[PDB]
């Protein structure tokens, strides 16, 4: 199955790349704001930190708490940023989880199909086998 992992992980990592590097400078006013009371500021600060926080968003743990802690940013009518991060998390999570489970159930499907065709060929060969055995018995 991980041999069949040829192009799906490439698309996964490249969507990770484009969305993370896009979301670096979207909530830029979060870490680079002078608010004293904040505790998720380090999430969006560095590029490696951006990778960490979009990995967290992909895993989808405390996205409500994360958005509430980015709600401390001055709310600019949520016109682009909140919808961007929400669409990214939902689309990436559901699309990639679904595509990997679909590929692996197809892997099980073709494993069982190959097994079934091998047993069917074995049974066909056995049928020809006792048919030729009857032919040999009559030929004697």
């Amino acid at each position: 199955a991980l041999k069949s992992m040829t192009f799906l992980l490439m698309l996964l990592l490249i969507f990770f790349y484009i969305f993370a590097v896009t979301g670096v400078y979207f909530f830029r006013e979060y870490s680079r704001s002078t608010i004293e009371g904040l505790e998720y500021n380090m999430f969006f600060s560095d590029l490696l930190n951006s990778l960490v926080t979009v990995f967290i968003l992909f895993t989808l743990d405390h996205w409500y708490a994360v958005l509430q802690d980015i709600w401390k940013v001055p709310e600019s009518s949520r016109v682009f940023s909140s919808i961007y991060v929400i669409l990214w998390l939902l689309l990436g999570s559901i699309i990639f989880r679904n595509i990997i489970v679909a590929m692996m159930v197809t892997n099980f499907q073709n494993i069982r199909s190959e097994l079934s065709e091998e047993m069917s060929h074995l049974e066909v060969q056995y049928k020809a086998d006792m048919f030729k055995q009857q032919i040999i018995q009559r030929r004697q």
Partner: protein, 174 residues
Amino acid sequence: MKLTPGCFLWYLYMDKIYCLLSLRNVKALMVYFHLLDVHHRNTLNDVLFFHFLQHVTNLNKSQIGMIFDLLDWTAVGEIGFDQFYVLICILLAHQDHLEDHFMYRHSRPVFELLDLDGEMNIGAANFQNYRFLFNIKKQELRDLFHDFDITGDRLLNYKEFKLYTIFCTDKSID
């Protein structure tokens, strides 16, 4: 008797299966085996067979060991005189061009020589051993295996192998 009736029948079958029956080829093989069989116990050790193969055919040590392992079906650590004669007839001056067609004709069953397993199916290891014994390209062997595996199970049937051998003989004759 002319060195037992079974060997006479085998020589008659070889003469009916080959254009030239040679002169005292079986006698020469028996003399070579008797020289190789030091104890005259109707068997030869692996060292004697390897030395004879290196002196006659100049084969590699690994190839000689593989040939001895394939020929010695009893797995008793020794090769019989009949097995040595069968191997020498299977070689039959394999460097000649007509020897390839003779090996394509193979023997009366012409199925069990490649099938070392004996379960009426020749795997990839048997094909590799045959390509080691008889010189053939890896790409050509893979193409022939793909042509033979009609079902795709990587197994060669006796009827399928016989049909492939008949087609190869017909193509080589024409």
